[PDB]
Design a protein around this ligand. Structure first.
Ligand SMILES: [Zn+2]
Ligand SMILES: [Zn+2]
Ligand SMILES: [Zn+2]
Ligand SMILES: [Zn+2]
Ligand SMILES: [Zn+2]
Ligand SMILES: [Zn+2]
Lengths: 63, 63, 62
DNA sequence: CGAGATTTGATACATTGTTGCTCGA
DNA sequence: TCGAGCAACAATGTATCAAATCTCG
């Protein structure tokens, strides 16, 4: 068995957790930028640049 | 129920209809701004915003 | 059984309404709401695009 | 009318982003 | 140990197909 079932970060950060399925637009803390939320947002830009790099190198191997 | 195979759009405007896989970054016309490709650039934001609206409608269905 | 539209412009306001010739009967015939505005823009892009192709093909002939 | 060309809603294919969670410094 | 960094869910984008309407002899 391999279940994951993700939960939203910003909702969990200010109080009650809630899993994301359609939640990306409905979030009540979609912006905010409180100093706690503000830090996790930088992590997302970092991870995105990181994962994008690995996917480029993954393409490089076939050539 | 029908076969599919992508080919790059921007490449077709100039001749070399190269099939699309990882080609989006290796493109010899990765940007370019001729009126042929200028329209295609407009075409992509319109279709993307349009399909995104339909993806929202699926959330309205809540199913 | 086959699956088929189901008009887009009607769905935007929720009333669904399948298309069979519904073009003119659409109840939102000629509309400029931000939702229905995109499809009108889509053909204007296509029309300007096809017009460009037919013109350049014509210019070389001289 | 029908045959071929042009719309137009629809979907398969590919890219990019987000969070759970491991593993080795 | 316990974080940095990887990969599984999930969004966003890209191009083509097929129903359908249109153009026209
Ligand atoms: Zn949330
Ligand atoms: Zn916050
Ligand atoms: Zn290309
Ligand atoms: Zn170009
Ligand atoms: Zn309608
Ligand atoms: Zn409308």
């Amino acid at each position: 068995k391999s279940p994951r079932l993700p939960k939203c970060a910003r909702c969990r950060n200010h109080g009650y957790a809630s899993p994301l399925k359609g939640h990306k637009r409905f979030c009540m803390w979609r912006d905010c930028q409180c100093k706690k939320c503000n830090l996790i947002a930088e992590r997302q830009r970092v991870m995105a640049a990181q994962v994008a790099l690995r996917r480029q190198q993954a393409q490089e191997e076939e050539l």
